[PDB]
Amino acid sequence: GGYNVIALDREYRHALVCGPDRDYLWILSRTPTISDEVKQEMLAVATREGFDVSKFIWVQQPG
Amino acid sequence: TPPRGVTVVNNFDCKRYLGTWYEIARFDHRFERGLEKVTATYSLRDDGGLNVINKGYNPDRGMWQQSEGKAYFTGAPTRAALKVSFF
């Protein structure tokens, strides 16, 4: 399966990763939680690139 | 091949991407469904690919579990497009 970093911040602290089609998408962070600002940005980029963000499951993390 | 029309990071610095990432969110597939506290850890192989370790807590088993993969760039390593296979 394809693994593509479609967006990444300059500090390599937050990444948006997709698989071989728009049914595969991940939000990755160097930290177990992210802020509302980072959330909205990632979601905005996802929607701009034609991903349906209603498909996201918010993974439980310590935090 | 990446999906038609999506961006791919094209000045990728593979060395700064190495180490541990927390999975904040995912589209749900069978392979990951039900797993919590999911991390992805990347390390550089000698052959220039990446080793991938995906770890998560499975509350049904009460156990941490992990799956190991090998990733290769499909072109320039400054282009963040790879393909991963799991063993």
Numbering used by the authors:
A (entry chain B): 114 to 176
B (entry chain A): 23 to 109
Show the paper's wording:
Fluorogen-activating proteins (FAPs) are a group of unrelated proteins capable of binding to non-protein ligands (fluorogens) and increase the fluorescence quantum yield and/or change spectral properties of these ligands. Here we report on DiB-splits, a self-assembling FAP split system which has been inspired by the domain-swapped structure of a full-length DiB protein.
To further confirm the recovery of the lipocalin fold by split DiBs, we crystalized the DiB2-split protein. Crystals diffracted to approximately 2 Å and contained three “split” molecules per asymmetric unit. According to size-exclusion chromatography conducted during purification routine of split proteins there were no signs of oligomerization of any kind. The main difference between superimposed monomers from the asymmetric unit is observed in the termini of the two β-strands adjacent to the cleavage site. The observed differences between structures might be partially caused by releasing the tension in the fold through polypeptide chain cleavage. This confirms that the split system is capable of spontaneous correct self-assembly to form the functional protein.
